Structure formats: structure tokens, C-alpha cells
Amino acid sequence: SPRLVGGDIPCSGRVEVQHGDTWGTVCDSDFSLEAASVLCRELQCGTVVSLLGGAHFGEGSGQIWAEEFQCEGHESHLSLCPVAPRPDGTCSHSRDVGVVCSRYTQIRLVNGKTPCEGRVELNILGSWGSLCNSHWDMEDAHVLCQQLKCGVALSIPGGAPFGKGSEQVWRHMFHCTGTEKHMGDCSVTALGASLCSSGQVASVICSGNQSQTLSPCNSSSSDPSSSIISEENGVACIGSGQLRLVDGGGRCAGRVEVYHEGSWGTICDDSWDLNDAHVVCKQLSCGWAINATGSAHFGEGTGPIWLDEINCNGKESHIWQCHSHGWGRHNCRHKEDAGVICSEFMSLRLISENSRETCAGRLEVFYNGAWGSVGRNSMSPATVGVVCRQLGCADRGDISPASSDKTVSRHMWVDNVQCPKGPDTLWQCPSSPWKKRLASPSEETWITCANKIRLQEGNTNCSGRVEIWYGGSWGTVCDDSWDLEDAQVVCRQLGCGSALEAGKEAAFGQGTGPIWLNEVKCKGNETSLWDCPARSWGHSDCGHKEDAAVTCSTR
Ligand SMILES: *[C@@H]1O[C@H](CO[C@@H]2O[C@@H](C)[C@@H](O)[C@@H](O)[C@@H]2O)[C@@H](O[C@@H]2O[C@H](CO)[C@@H](O[C@]3(O)O[C@H](CO[C@H]4O[C@H](CO)[C@@H](O)[C@H](O)[C@@H]4O)[C@@H](O)[C@H](O[C@H]4O[C@H](CO)[C@@H](O)[C@H](O)[C@@H]4O)[C@@H]3O)[C@H](O)[C@H]2NC(C)=O)[C@H](O)[C@H]1NC(C)=O
Ligand SMILES: *[C@@H]1O[C@H](CO)[C@@H](O[C@@H]2O[C@H](CO)[C@@H](O)[C@H](O)[C@H]2NC(C)=O)[C@H](O)[C@H]1NC(C)=O
Numbered sequence: 001s002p003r004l005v006g007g008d009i010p011c012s013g014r015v016e017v018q019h020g021d022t023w024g025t026v027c028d029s030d031f032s033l034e035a036a037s038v039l040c041r042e043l044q045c046g047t048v049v050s051l052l053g054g055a056h057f058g059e060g061s062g063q064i065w066a067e068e069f070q071c072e073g074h075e076s077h078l079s080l081c082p083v084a085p086r087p088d089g090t091c092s093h094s095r096d097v098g099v100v101c102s103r104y105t106q107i108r109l110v111n112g113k114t115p116c117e118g119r120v121e122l123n124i125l126g127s128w129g130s131l132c133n134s135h136w137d138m139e140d141a142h143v144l145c146q147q148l149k150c151g152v153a154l155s156i157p158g159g160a161p162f163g164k165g166s167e168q169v170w171r172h173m174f175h176c177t178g179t180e181k182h183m184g185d186c187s188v189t190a191l192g193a194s195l196c197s198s199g200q201v202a203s204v205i206c207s208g209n210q211s212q213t214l215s216p217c218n219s220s221s222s223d224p225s226s227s228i229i230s231e232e233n234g235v236a237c238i239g240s241g242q243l244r245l246v247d248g249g250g251r252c253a254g255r256v257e258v259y260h261e262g263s264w265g266t267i268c269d270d271s272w273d274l275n276d277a278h279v280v281c282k283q284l285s286c287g288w289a290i291n292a293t294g295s296a297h298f299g300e301g302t303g304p305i306w307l308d309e310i311n312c313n314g315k316e317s318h319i320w321q322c323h324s325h326g327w328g329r330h331n332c333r334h335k336e337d338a339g340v341i342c343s344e345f346m347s348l349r350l351i352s353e354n355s356r357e358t359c360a361g362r363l364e365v366f367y368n369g370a371w372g373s374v375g376r377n378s379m380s381p382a383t384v385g386v387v388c389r390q391l392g393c394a395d396r397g398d399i400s401p402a403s404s405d406k407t408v409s410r411h412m413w414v415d416n417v418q419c420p421k422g423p424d425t426l427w428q429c430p431s432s433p434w435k436k437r438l439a440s441p442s443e444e445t446w447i448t449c450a451n452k453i454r455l456q457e458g459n460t461n462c463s464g465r466v467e468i469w470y471g472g473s474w475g476t477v478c479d480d481s482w483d484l485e486d487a488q489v490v491c492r493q494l495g496c497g498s499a500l501e502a503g504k505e506a507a508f509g510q511g512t513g514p515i516w517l518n519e520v521k522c523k524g525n526e527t528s529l530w531d532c533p534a535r536s537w538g539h540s541d542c543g544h545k546e547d548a549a550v551t552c553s554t555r
């Protein structure tokens with residue numbers, strides 16, 4: 001029923017809702033993340049990446065609905081959601097709301113008899129291109145054939161039987177587990193990804209829909225299977241990967257957890273060494289191990305301790321092939337849970353030399369066990385916004401002028417980062433391949449991100465209406481329980497001096513967008529308003545007439 005209009009990528013655009021024959025738009029104060037998540041699910045577009053206010057995909061025409069959608073979040077249709085007519089707002093079409101959903105992938109098969117076979121093409125940065133044969137597996141093929149409604153995947157032939165194509169190769173590495181129902185639901189990396197030999201391109205043959213798509217396997221009674229395909233209730237089924245890493249801050253690090261007898265469980269760190277970790281990292285397509293961690297380094301598990309005294313020599317393609325003590329009944333506690341850090345683990349930081357700054361510094365990436373600088377070549381404002389969103393700031397920032405210093409000191413990891421529309425992390429952005437080399441500050445990137453809190457419409461930047469950035473868009477704070485202790489937190493976070501006032505009742509003017517917080521009840525010693533007790537993320541009965549303000553002293 002709902003439609004997205006005016007987007008550049010699929011599953012994006014301005015939100016439009018029909019009643020009767022009349023389409024209308026929704027004001028950016030009326031449409032929550034929960035309502036956005038119901039729309040993305042209903043439209044088969046995955047999950048919500050961004051809620052965007054301010055007529056980002058252009059202003060609409062005609063009707064604007066006066067209704068708020070009070071979705072719980074798990075409704076199947078937007079029509080099932082409770083609707084509250086709010087008082088008749090000052091919303092024009094310059095505040096029509098918009099949504100980026102997660103299934104923005106543009107992928108197809110070209111030059112076979114049907115769309116059920118051919119060379120894989122991916123559209124990135126307005127341009128169709130191939131994928132590398134070495135970057136594409138059978139798990140990826142099963143997901144794509146289900147997406148194209150073409151049954152199951154038969155083959156991934158390497159010798160280009162449908163033509164190499166007259167075009168570019170994207171170096172993207174999909175890491176589908178095999179149980180996903182759209183390529184947009186799979187984890188994917190493009191950052192630093194290696195080139196492949198010319199014309200070594202990926203191809204898929206699907207079965208067609210004369211076979212139905214396999215369901216995921218649901219059983220953990222037996223020893224886990226090392227094949228993609230298992231047998232369950234007289235039907236073939238895709239093995240859901242019964243190994244995960246948790247609490248590592250990424251796909252290729254964290255505590256090793258294993259699914260058996262209906263429960264996720266941990267591994268004891270006795271005899272847990274690098275060879276064991278290598279097998280884990282191989283099985284997850286995470287490269288090689290750089291660390292086998294013990295001593296509950298990423299935290300302690302909730303569930304049984306299934307495996308102990310695992311002694312892989314490193315041959316094995318799965319941890320289930322390794323010699324252990326078998327399932328359950330071991331003489332150790334969760335203070336010794338095992339984990340890994342693998343060579344494909346990626347992390348991101350800004351480093352200030354003398355500190356004081358929170359959203360500013362030299363951009364650095366962690367890869368293959370090492371930190372290194374990100375080069376500044378080709379780097380657009382939109383790429384800096386993705387960086388700044390990923391580091392926990394607002395989605396905008398500025399690159400400092402290049403240093404005159406042409407003499408090499410630090411290691412660089414990657415350069416030529418060029419983010420497309422849609423990802424909110426740097427890892428799905430194409431670049432040059434990883435190359436550890438020495439580099440001068442001439443080549444390095446210093447970033448000043450916009451903070452996720454600001455004061456608008458006063459005589460300094462330390463005085464005005466409180467606005468907070470969350471989930472895509474700037475929004476406001478309601479003034480119920482908003483006191484001087486809240487203002488002392490806002491002033492401290494901005495790096496202003498003493499709080500003078502906690503203003504109420506839209507004293508510097510009403511804002512736009514959603515109202516992200518109400519019932520903010522700070523102790524008063526917090527370093528950020530995100531540490532404060534509040535009714536978080538858009539559940540409020542307020543309007544923009546009740547917007548909160550802070551006035552602080554400079555310096
Ligand atoms: C297996 O795949 C094929 C191919 O499907 C298409 O390609 C894949 C890659 C996907 O993208 C998929 O979404 C595509 O559709 C499926 O064949 C298609 O099947 C659909 C559904 O049955 C057909 O639509 C119609 O059935 O067409 C009927 C009219 O058929 C005449 O006209 C067609 C051209 O328009 C001719 O191809 C056909 O030979 C006839 O001469 C029409 O009666 C149907 O409409 C009625 O029912 C719908 C609800 O389903 C209702 O909304 C309407 O009001 C109406 O009452 C319907 O339009 C496709 O024409 C057909 N495409 C091709 C290329 O053959 C196949 O269904 C699928 N099998 C399974 C098990 O899923
Ligand atoms: C993961 O492995 C690396 C490599 O051994 C560890 O880095 C070293 O840490 C020790 C002690 O902290 C230092 O003496 C070495 O100089 C470091 N070497 C290198 C090459 O970086 C790292 O500490 C390990 N991390 C975890 C969590 O186990």
C-alpha cells in the first residue's frame with residue numbers, strides 16, 4: 001500500500017500513503033523509525049537504514065496527512081498500525097519524510113536463456129559491472145536465485161560461459177551464509193578488496209522455479225554438518241551456520257559461539273591456540289587468525305560450555321572436524337570463554353594527538369592485525385559523512401587542508417575511497433586494494449565531523465534550541481522534566497562553559513523533524529546526553545511547541 005518515490009537507489013525515496021484514490025505525503029514529525037520499519041518490511045525492502053526529513057528526495061505535491069503512525073514496529077502492514085490525527089500542523093512539503101531501506105542492491109544475471117542464468121552484474125555508482133569469480137561462492141548463488149525467484153542454485157561456472165561482458169569488474173565480496181532471501185541481507189565488503197584477473201568473472205546457473213528454494217535447516221541434535229546442504233524431515237535444506245562471533249564489534253572478531261542441542265554455547269580456552277582460531281576464521285570466510293583469545297576477553301557467554309580442549313592442526317575446514325573432548329560436561333567456567341580476531345576484521349578510529357576533541361582527528365583503519373592511515377585521495381564529502389556516521393557523530397564533516405610535510409612517517413592502509421548511496425559503513429565502499437606502505441601527512445586525512453548535538457538559532461553556538469542527530473535525521477528534545485542538570489550535560493558535551501538556562505516552550509523557535517527524546521532526567525555529571533535517563537528514540541506525546549533549549553556561557 002505505501003510507496004517510496006524519488007529515490008536514486010531501490011528501496012529509497014519519499015514516503016507516500018494512499019487513502020481512497022488520493023496519495024499523500026507524511027510530515028517528518030509524524031513518522032517514526034517503527035513506522036519506517038513496518039513500511040520497509042511491507043514493501044519487501046528489508047530494514048531501515050535512515051529516516052530522512054527535510055524533503056531530501058524533493059518536495060511532494062498535494063495532500064499531506066495529519067495522522068501520526070503509532071506503529072509498535074512488528075506490524076505486517078502500515079494499515080494495521082494505530083493512527084492518531086495530531087493537531088493541524090505547520091508542515092509543508094519541505095518537511096516530507098523519506099526512508100532508506102537496506103535492500104538497495106541492484107544485481108542481475110545477463111545473457112542466459114532466462115533471468116535464471118547468466119553472468120552476475122552489480123550496479124554501483126551508476127554503473128553496471130561484473131563480479132570476480134574468486135569473490136563469489138555457492139552460498140551467494142543460492143541467495144541470488146531465491147531473490148530472482150528462480151529456484152535453487154546449480155552451478156557457479158568459472159570459465160565465463162555467458163560471456164565476460166564488455167565492462168568493469170566490481171571487487172565486492174558477498175559473504176552470504178546461504179539462508180538469506182535477498183542479496184541486500186547478506187554481509188558484504190568492498191573496502192580494500194583485491195582486483196582479480198581480467199575476465200575471471202562470476203556466473204550463476206539456477207534451476208528455475210521447477211525446483212522450489214530450500215529452507216534453512218533447523219536441527220542441532222547431531223554433530224554439525226560441514227556441507228552447505230543437509231537432510232532434514234525427508235527434504236534438503238541449507239545449513240544455517242552454527243558458529244558465530246559475538247561482542248567483537250564486527251563480523252571477523254569476537255567470542256566463538258556454537259549452536260548445539262537447541263542452544264548457543266561457548267568454547268573453553270584450555271588448549272585454545274592459533275591453529276584452532278585459523279580453522280574458525282577459515283570457516284567464517286574471515287581470512288586467517290591473528291589472535292586466539294582466552295580469559296573471556298570479549299565477555300562471558302550465556303548458555304552451556306559445549307566444546308573444550310580443541311586441538312586442530314589447522315588442516316580442517318570446519319571446527320567440527322577437529323579433535324576435542326566432545327559435547328558438554330567440562331571442568332571450566334565462563335571466565336575462560338574463547339574468542340578470535342581474524343585478518344579480515346576491520347575497525348575505524350579518529351586519533352587526536354593532544355585529545356580534547358571527540359569528533360575530530362586523523363582517520364585510521366584497523367586491518368590484518370594493524371592500524372594504518374586512510375589516504376585522502378578522491379575523498380568526497382559524502383564519504384566523510386559515512387565515516388562520521390560510523391564513528392558515532394552526525395553524518396557530515398570536513399577534511400582539513402593537506403600538510404606541507406612530504407616526508408613519510410606512518411603506515412597507510414587504503415586510499416581512493418568512493419562511497420555509493422546507501423551504505424552507512426565504510427566497508428561497503430569501493431577503494432584501491434589494501435596496500436600497507438609508509439606515508440607522509442601530505443597523503444593522510446584529518447576529519448572534523450559535525451557533532452551529534454548542536455544548539456540552533458541563538459546568538460552563539462553555545463545558545464539556542466537543542467537538536468540531536470539520530471538514525472538519519474536531526475531532531476529535537478521535549479521540555480517535560482527538562483531542567484538545569486540536563487543543560488549542564490549539554491554544555492559539557494558541546495565544550496561550552498557554565499549552563500545559564502534550560503529553556504522551555506520553543507524559546508528560540510520550534511524545530512522540525514521528530515522529537516527524539518523526552519523525560520530527560522540527567523544526574524548532571526554526564527559527559528553526554530546519551531548517558532542520561534530518558535524515554536529514548538521517538539516515543540513522546542510532545543509537539544514542537546514544547547521544544548527544549550539550553551543557554552551556556554562561551555569558554
Ligand atoms: C516461474 O517463472 C516464470 C517466469 O517468471 C518471470 O520471471 C522471473 C525471473 C520472475 O521475475 C517472475 O516474477 C516473472 O513473472 C513464471 O511465469 C510467469 O508467470 C506469471 C504468473 O502466472 C505470468 O503472469 C500471468 O499468469 O499471465 C497470465 C496471462 O498469460 C498470457 O500472457 C502472458 C504475457 O503477459 C504469456 O506469457 C502467457 O503465455 C499468456 O499468453 C494472466 O492470466 C495472469 O494474470 C491473472 O492472475 C494475476 C494473479 O497472478 C492477476 O493479478 C490478474 O488480474 C489476472 O487475473 C498473470 O499475469 C507471467 O506471464 C509469466 N511470465 C513468463 C515470462 O512466462 C512462472 O509463474 C513461475 N512459476 C512459479 C511456480 O512461480
Ligand atoms: C593479538 O596479537 C598481537 C600480536 O601478538 C598482540 O600484539 C602485541 O601485544 C603484546 C602485549 O600486549 C606486545 O608486547 C607486542 O609488542 C604486540 N605485538 C604486535 C605485533 O602488535 C595483541 O596484544 C593481541 N591482542 C589480544 C587481545 O590478544
Ligand SMILES: *[C@@H]1O[C@H](CO)[C@@H](O[C@@H]2O[C@H](CO)[C@@H](O)[C@H](O)[C@H]2NC(C)=O)[C@H](O)[C@H]1NC(C)=O
Nearest residue numbers: 489492522523524525526527528529530531532
Ligand atoms: C556520575 O555519577 C554517578 C553517580 O550516581 C556515577 O555512577 C556510578 O556508576 C557505577 C557503574 O559502574 C556504579 O557502580 C557506581 O556505584 C555509581 N556511583 C558512584 C557514586 O560512583 C557515574 O559513573 C558518574 N559519571 C561520570 C561521567 O562522572
Ligand SMILES: *[C@@H]1O[C@H](CO)[C@@H](O)[C@H](O)[C@H]1NC(C)=O
Nearest residue numbers: 215216217218232233235237
Ligand atoms: C525451519 O524453520 C523455518 C522457520 O520456522 C521454516 O520456515 C522452515 O520451513 C523450516 N525448515 C525445515 C527443513 O524444517
Ligand SMILES: *[C@@H]1O[C@H](CO)[C@@H](O)[C@H](O)[C@H]1NC(C)=O
Nearest residue numbers: 454460461462493494495496
Ligand atoms: C563555536 O564557534 C567557535 C568559533 O571559532 C568555535 O571555535 C567553537 O568550536 C564552536 N563551538 C561549538 C560548540 O560549536
